[PDB]
Amino acid sequence: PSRFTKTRKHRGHVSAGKGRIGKHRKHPGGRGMAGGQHHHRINMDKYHPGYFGKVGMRYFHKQQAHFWKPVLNLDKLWTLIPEDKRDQYLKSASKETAPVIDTLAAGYGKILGKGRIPNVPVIVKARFVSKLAEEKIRAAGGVVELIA
Amino acid sequence: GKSHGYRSRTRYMFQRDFRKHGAVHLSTYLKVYKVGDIVDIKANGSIQKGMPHKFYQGKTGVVYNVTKSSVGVIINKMVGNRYLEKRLNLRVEHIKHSKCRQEFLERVKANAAKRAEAKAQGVAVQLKRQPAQPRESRIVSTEGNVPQTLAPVPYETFI
Amino acid sequence: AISKNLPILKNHFRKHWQERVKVHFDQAGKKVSRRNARATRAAKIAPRP
Amino acid sequence: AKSKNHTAHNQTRKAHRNGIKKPKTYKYPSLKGVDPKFRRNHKHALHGTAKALAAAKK
Amino acid sequence: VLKKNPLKNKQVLLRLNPYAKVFAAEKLGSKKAEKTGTKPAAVFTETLKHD
Amino acid sequence: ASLPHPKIVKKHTKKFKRHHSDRYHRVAENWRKQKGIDSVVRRRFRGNISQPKIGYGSNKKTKFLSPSGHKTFLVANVKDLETLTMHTKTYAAEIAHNISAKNRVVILARAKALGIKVTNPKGRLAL
Amino acid sequence: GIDHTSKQHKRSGHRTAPKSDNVYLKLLVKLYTFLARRTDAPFNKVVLKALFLSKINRPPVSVSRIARALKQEGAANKTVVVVGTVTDDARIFEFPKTTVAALRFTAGARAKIVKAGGECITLDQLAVRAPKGQNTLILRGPRNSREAVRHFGMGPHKGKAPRILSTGRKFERARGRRRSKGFKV
Amino acid sequence: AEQVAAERAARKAANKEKRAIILERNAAYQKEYETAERNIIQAKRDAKAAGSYYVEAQHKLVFVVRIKGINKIPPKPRKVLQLLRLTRINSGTFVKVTKATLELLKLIEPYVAYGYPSYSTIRQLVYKRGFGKINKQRVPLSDNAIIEANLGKYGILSIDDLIHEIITVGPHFKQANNFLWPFKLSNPSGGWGVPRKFKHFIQGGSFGNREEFINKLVKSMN
RNA sequence: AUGCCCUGACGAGUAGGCAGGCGUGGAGGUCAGUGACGAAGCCUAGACCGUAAGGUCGGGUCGAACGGCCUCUAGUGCAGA
RNA sequence: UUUUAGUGGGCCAUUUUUGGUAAGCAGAACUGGCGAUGCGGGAUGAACCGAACGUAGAGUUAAGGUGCCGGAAUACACGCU
RNA sequence: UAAUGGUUAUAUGCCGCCCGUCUUGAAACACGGACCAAGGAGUCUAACGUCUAUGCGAGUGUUUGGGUGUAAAACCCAUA
Ligand SMILES: [Mg+2]
Ligand SMILES: [Mg+2]
Ligand SMILES: [Mg+2]
Ligand SMILES: [Mg+2]
Ligand SMILES: [Mg+2]
Ligand SMILES: [Mg+2]
Ligand SMILES: [Mg+2]
Ligand SMILES: [Mg+2]
Ligand SMILES: [Mg+2]
Ligand SMILES: [Mg+2]
Ligand SMILES: [Mg+2]
Ligand SMILES: [Mg+2]
Ligand SMILES: [Mg+2]
Ligand SMILES: [Mg+2]
Ligand SMILES: [Mg+2]
Ligand SMILES: [Mg+2]
Ligand SMILES: [Mg+2]
Ligand SMILES: [Mg+2]
Ligand SMILES: [Mg+2]
Ligand SMILES: [Mg+2]
Ligand SMILES: [Mg+2]
Ligand SMILES: [Mg+2]
Ligand SMILES: [Mg+2]
Ligand SMILES: [Mg+2]
Ligand SMILES: [Mg+2]
Ligand SMILES: [Mg+2]
Ligand SMILES: [Mg+2]
Ligand SMILES: [Mg+2]
Ligand SMILES: [Mg+2]
Ligand SMILES: [Mg+2]
Ligand SMILES: [Mg+2]
Ligand SMILES: [Mg+2]
Ligand SMILES: [Mg+2]
Ligand SMILES: [Mg+2]
Ligand SMILES: [Mg+2]
Ligand SMILES: [Mg+2]
Ligand SMILES: [Mg+2]
Ligand SMILES: [Mg+2]
Ligand SMILES: [Mg+2]
Ligand SMILES: [Mg+2]
Ligand SMILES: [Mg+2]
Ligand SMILES: [Mg+2]
Ligand SMILES: [Mg+2]
Ligand SMILES: [Mg+2]
Ligand SMILES: [Mg+2]
Ligand SMILES: [Mg+2]
Ligand SMILES: [Mg+2]
Ligand SMILES: [Mg+2]
Ligand SMILES: [Mg+2]
Ligand SMILES: [Mg+2]
Ligand SMILES: [Mg+2]
Ligand SMILES: [Mg+2]
Ligand SMILES: [Mg+2]
Ligand SMILES: [Mg+2]
Ligand SMILES: [Mg+2]
Ligand SMILES: [Mg+2]
Ligand SMILES: [Mg+2]
Ligand SMILES: [Mg+2]
Ligand SMILES: [Mg+2]
Ligand SMILES: [Mg+2]
Ligand SMILES: [Mg+2]
Ligand SMILES: [Mg+2]
Ligand SMILES: [Mg+2]
Ligand SMILES: [Mg+2]
Ligand SMILES: [Mg+2]
Ligand SMILES: [Mg+2]
Ligand SMILES: [Mg+2]
Ligand SMILES: [Mg+2]
Ligand SMILES: [Mg+2]
Ligand SMILES: [Mg+2]
Ligand SMILES: [Mg+2]
Ligand SMILES: [Mg+2]
Ligand SMILES: [Mg+2]
Ligand SMILES: [Mg+2]
Ligand SMILES: [Mg+2]
Ligand SMILES: [Mg+2]
Ligand SMILES: [Mg+2]
Ligand SMILES: [Mg+2]
Ligand SMILES: [Mg+2]
Ligand SMILES: [Mg+2]
Ligand SMILES: [Mg+2]
Ligand SMILES: [Mg+2]
Ligand SMILES: [Mg+2]
Ligand SMILES: [Mg+2]
Ligand SMILES: [Mg+2]
Ligand SMILES: [Mg+2]
Ligand SMILES: [Mg+2]
Ligand SMILES: [Mg+2]
Ligand SMILES: [Mg+2]
Ligand SMILES: [Mg+2]
Ligand SMILES: [Mg+2]
Ligand SMILES: [Mg+2]
Ligand SMILES: [Mg+2]
Ligand SMILES: [Mg+2]
Ligand SMILES: [Mg+2]
Ligand SMILES: [Mg+2]
Ligand SMILES: [Mg+2]
Ligand SMILES: [Mg+2]
Ligand SMILES: [Mg+2]
């Protein structure tokens, strides 16, 4: 797509769209993030507020798998049961045969309570849950099982 | 150098209006302001608290807030190419009611009254105002009024 | 310079990075040769898997 | 070298190119700077009115 | 397609204004005024001819 | 003959030559617009050349028509020529420049048999 | 000369045709152009204008949004018309009987609508069984829920999401963003 | 059974009904104009015979013509010329006289010639240069049905109904006057008089109030 | 039927923006395209079309290849430095 | 509502102004202009008067003119020199 | 048919200062330009904003690799 560029349209016109007065130069305000505190201060504060200075405490040698805790919400939570079993498990809801959902086996680390599972009892195996996730799961007639 | 303080160029604006110096009369403090009333701004120079900026002299706005001794006023101010709403925190001696909002409310009551006497009988009573009209045909009498006037006057110096 | 509301970029090209550009034009050729090496090695280590 | 300090020439014609805008008022302005005690009581006076019009219709 | 002027073009002057025939037939543009003989007052003529 | 068209009005018969193409050999006569800040041609001073502008464009009834009254159609052979069979009052066949003489004879014979007007029935003829 | 008040030769600023080279969408535009001109139903004009719109101007409509629109009073049997894609929603477990006319259905959305006993209809079948838009309910997806709109109007005291590549501590949470380091905002 | 022979005839009967109404309206308007002007002449005569002075009712209609071109106009006159829709030279507009518009005409005074138009000039202006504004698109009048299609709500049926609503400033003068496109007049065919236009008419130029000489001017420009 | 037709208004422009087009090298497709009975190039106060960028034809010279359209691509258009 | 170009040397006129004896000087205010703009007139001229411009035709004009150069009255009139 | 028209040369009347450039201002006693031909200047990449188009859509991204092949193509594919 070289033929669609405006370089093809600026052919014949002297300044190539850059002006005769201002007269396109190499680096008229500096290179990179130059002068963010001196001549580019307004473009810093107004559009990058918070850019300069320090924020809180350093962590030497952070491994981002001490922090792997993907969050599942109860509004989904029945997607983890496959669709052929989902219909038969929510039709004629039952304790003494409730679905067991391993949330870790689907790759989440915490259950959170976004809203409104149906009133079918569920056995939810989680590494972590929130309080309202617990309250709504037990209000459906189910249980949270803590796993590691 | 230059000087652009808060009360710069206010030598005459905040002056206290010959033989009306001293204490503020008490109807100023007993007028009642509701939220939505349209008020005029004129700073008393003898009260320095709650005092508006000199821009707001002669400006007219709407009460949005009422406090212990002060009202908040919305003023539209022309900043560049648009209007910005300004919120002012002015004590009530810098504030007076607009008499225009009196006159328009008696026009509203007159409109309702004449619409009631048009509903009683005689619909289409034509109740908008009109601009001043070209005058109709007169007959001007010449009864003790015979038109008698002289000419332009000669130049004399009278010095 | 710094101009309009754009994310602040961190492109690290202030070295002579063009002396060290590897383009993998030989992706298909190295795949052909890995399959050739697997076939040759299989024939060398007949029936072993 | 010495130059032109300041002028307001051409600035009103630029401001009237897009023709100075009134700020587009709405029913229900914000409570920005409205008195906090009035705001606190307004919250409860509207809670009770929501319940009153709930019980009036149902 | 073509604007024809009335006060030329009597056909368009009859398409607009069907009273244009009656106006011409009674002639209505050169009609005689009633011939009254009302005379102005001496105060009017005195003021008119005054210095 | 061709269709009844109105009298063809061209609005500017004269070629739009480039400024100073008369003056310099390196400046060809092909139209270029002046982009100069002080160009009298660009600023349209009186006594200078005209510039091509859209007001000179031909009336769409007579546009692309020849003085004969036909739109021209470039033709290489008999099969290209016979796509103009039902259009002999709107279209005249131009024979392409690179057609050899013995194929030109064949094209001209087919166009005489079909009634197609040929704008160049004289190229490559032993005359 | 003329003292012009308005700007001369000003285009409307509205798409009068789709910018896409989709032949089937051109056929839909031809059909609804005909209906909007010969019917004098306002539905047909609205559908033609919505057929012109771009991708971010046609957000998807979820089936949960369809079902919530069908829970309106008197709107249970209306034909839901989405000029755009209907997506599935796993957060809803009851889906009502419906006729949905849409440009596109996802596989989950088509499965959910026809598993609830309903029917998925294109805009030409909608035009045949409802030439005037009789008994219809047009649904539009949320336009300003897009990620781009978060960064729109960035400035002081706006609360409008800086354009930032990596996020965390050390990425714009300092001078200009809290009282302790300089000022807040 | 397309019923051309009876649909055309029923439409023709409706046309003849409308033309009968237009004919009796114009006869009534002609009698009204004649009795108004003869009553003003006789009122002047009777006041002179009584020794009084009959003061005429002040004029209610002026016809304004923009006589200065486009360049170098200050912004407040430029705004008022746009508001009176005099956006080019030799544009004309009928103006109802109020205080609210006599102070507009004082602002645009060096750029316009105005005065009080007679029935002859209003008639000739509307028959020759009269155009309507119909989705806006500047439509020539040339037909009473297209006048009725936009002004029939106000009881304006024909071009002479339009002229009457202009000259006697009725309750729908605003609608009848905004329906007319601003009159696109030529230059005056004999000239302006006046070797220099841009003085006051009192001072020997063209602009301002030329009270009843605007009829001569606009008839030369029309 | 980004077709055809109707009606109305409008048209200055540096810096600049956007659009619709013209042209050049090469690529995919097509015209079962042109060509040693003459391709390309070049010359031509000869012709035709286009507002123009340009396109086409006639005559001369020449001797082996090269065009139209639909797309793709760029080391793609010069009076200056 | 988003996005982005150029610009961030200005200058002239009327009016209001400051410094200066003053300046085609320096500096402000309001508007109109030139820059960025041809056309008719001011012989000539960035800015003045008039008027802003698609290509043509006819008509009428503006400003300015009408002895001759030069299109148009060596017009008519009252005086002055 | 060159009779009307086109083109061209010439004569005549009126008009017409040398382009490019910086500049408030250029015909300038500002600068480059004797002339001609050929070459000759917003490109490619990494990351990214807006918009648009397309595919799928609570998902999406086959091409790191593996399989396959008429073999740098095309086709197919798991875990991440
Ligand atoms: Mg493209
Ligand atoms: Mg150039
Ligand atoms: Mg170009
Ligand atoms: Mg340009
Ligand atoms: Mg640019
Ligand atoms: Mg340059
Ligand atoms: Mg720059
Ligand atoms: Mg720049
Ligand atoms: Mg510093
Ligand atoms: Mg920092
Ligand atoms: Mg710290
Ligand atoms: Mg630390
Ligand atoms: Mg919780
Ligand atoms: Mg001070
Ligand atoms: Mg003071
Ligand atoms: Mg005072
Ligand atoms: Mg204090
Ligand atoms: Mg910015
Ligand atoms: Mg392979
Ligand atoms: Mg290898
Ligand atoms: Mg191996
Ligand atoms: Mg120095
Ligand atoms: Mg400066
Ligand atoms: Mg100023
Ligand atoms: Mg501006
Ligand atoms: Mg502005
Ligand atoms: Mg030509
Ligand atoms: Mg040309
Ligand atoms: Mg050259
Ligand atoms: Mg050239
Ligand atoms: Mg240029
Ligand atoms: Mg020049
Ligand atoms: Mg030049
Ligand atoms: Mg759109
Ligand atoms: Mg997101
Ligand atoms: Mg964004
Ligand atoms: Mg990342
Ligand atoms: Mg943090
Ligand atoms: Mg940091
Ligand atoms: Mg008006
Ligand atoms: Mg109106
Ligand atoms: Mg006009
Ligand atoms: Mg004459
Ligand atoms: Mg004159
Ligand atoms: Mg004058
Ligand atoms: Mg004048
Ligand atoms: Mg125009
Ligand atoms: Mg233009
Ligand atoms: Mg074009
Ligand atoms: Mg190449
Ligand atoms: Mg090529
Ligand atoms: Mg290839
Ligand atoms: Mg041979
Ligand atoms: Mg050859
Ligand atoms: Mg060669
Ligand atoms: Mg030659
Ligand atoms: Mg030859
Ligand atoms: Mg040879
Ligand atoms: Mg050879
Ligand atoms: Mg060839
Ligand atoms: Mg190259
Ligand atoms: Mg190059
Ligand atoms: Mg060039
Ligand atoms: Mg150049
Ligand atoms: Mg050179
Ligand atoms: Mg831009
Ligand atoms: Mg500078
Ligand atoms: Mg000066
Ligand atoms: Mg200049
Ligand atoms: Mg400049
Ligand atoms: Mg000018
Ligand atoms: Mg003049
Ligand atoms: Mg002159
Ligand atoms: Mg002079
Ligand atoms: Mg003047
Ligand atoms: Mg002009
Ligand atoms: Mg003469
Ligand atoms: Mg002959
Ligand atoms: Mg001949
Ligand atoms: Mg000569
Ligand atoms: Mg000559
Ligand atoms: Mg000559
Ligand atoms: Mg001569
Ligand atoms: Mg001469
Ligand atoms: Mg000359
Ligand atoms: Mg230079
Ligand atoms: Mg200088
Ligand atoms: Mg100068
Ligand atoms: Mg120059
Ligand atoms: Mg000099
Ligand atoms: Mg020098
Ligand atoms: Mg230099
Ligand atoms: Mg040179
Ligand atoms: Mg030199
Ligand atoms: Mg060269
Ligand atoms: Mg070259
Ligand atoms: Mg170069
Ligand atoms: Mg992938
Ligand atoms: Mg594949």
PDB file of C-alpha atoms (C1' of nucleotides) in Angstrom, chain H residues 68-73 75 78 186-192 195-198, chain J residues 31-34 37-38 47-52 59-65:
ATOM      1  CA  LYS H  68     -23.469  48.055  -0.207  1.00  0.00           C
ATOM      2  CA  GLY H  69     -21.489  44.937  -1.081  1.00  0.00           C
ATOM      3  CA  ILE H  70     -19.984  42.221   1.069  1.00  0.00           C
ATOM      4  CA  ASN H  71     -16.530  43.407   2.086  1.00  0.00           C
ATOM      5  CA  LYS H  72     -15.492  45.537   5.087  1.00  0.00           C
ATOM      6  CA  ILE H  73     -18.675  45.503   7.183  1.00  0.00           C
ATOM      7  CA  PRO H  75     -19.862  42.759  12.853  1.00  0.00           C
ATOM      8  CA  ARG H  78     -23.180  42.329   9.399  1.00  0.00           C
ATOM      9  CA  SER H 186     -30.937  44.214 -10.585  1.00  0.00           C
ATOM     10  CA  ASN H 187     -29.074  47.490 -10.653  1.00  0.00           C
ATOM     11  CA  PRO H 188     -31.335  50.492 -11.350  1.00  0.00           C
ATOM     12  CA  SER H 189     -31.909  50.766 -15.078  1.00  0.00           C
ATOM     13  CA  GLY H 190     -31.547  54.533 -15.212  1.00  0.00           C
ATOM     14  CA  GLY H 191     -28.877  54.762 -12.525  1.00  0.00           C
ATOM     15  CA  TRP H 192     -28.933  55.779  -8.899  1.00  0.00           C
ATOM     16  CA  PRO H 195     -22.888  60.482  -8.378  1.00  0.00           C
ATOM     17  CA  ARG H 196     -21.928  59.032  -4.971  1.00  0.00           C
ATOM     18  CA  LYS H 197     -24.123  56.329  -3.421  1.00  0.00           C
ATOM     19  CA  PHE H 198     -22.641  56.090   0.046  1.00  0.00           C
TER      20      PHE H 198
ATOM     21  C1'   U J  31     -13.176  46.823  14.325  1.00  0.00           C
ATOM     22  C1'   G J  32     -11.980  46.143   9.180  1.00  0.00           C
ATOM     23  C1'   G J  33      -8.244  44.572   6.031  1.00  0.00           C
ATOM     24  C1'   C J  34      -3.219  42.772   3.701  1.00  0.00           C
ATOM     25  C1'   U J  37      -6.468  38.028  -3.254  1.00  0.00           C
ATOM     26  C1'   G J  38      -7.255  38.309  -8.350  1.00  0.00           C
ATOM     27  C1'   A J  47      -3.092  47.443   2.711  1.00  0.00           C
ATOM     28  C1'   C J  48      -7.134  53.235  -0.035  1.00  0.00           C
ATOM     29  C1'   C J  49     -12.315  53.505  -2.882  1.00  0.00           C
ATOM     30  C1'   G J  50     -15.480  50.016  -5.202  1.00  0.00           C
ATOM     31  C1'   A J  51     -16.134  45.039  -5.426  1.00  0.00           C
ATOM     32  C1'   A J  52     -14.147  39.697  -3.738  1.00  0.00           C
ATOM     33  C1'   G J  59     -28.232  43.932 -19.909  1.00  0.00           C
ATOM     34  C1'   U J  60     -27.399  47.453 -15.688  1.00  0.00           C
ATOM     35  C1'   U J  61     -24.070  49.531 -12.463  1.00  0.00           C
ATOM     36  C1'   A J  62     -20.193  50.796  -8.336  1.00  0.00           C
ATOM     37  C1'   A J  63     -15.836  53.559  -7.486  1.00  0.00           C
ATOM     38  C1'   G J  64     -13.741  56.657 -10.904  1.00  0.00           C
ATOM     39  C1'   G J  65     -14.437  59.465 -15.078  1.00  0.00           C
TER      40        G J  65
END
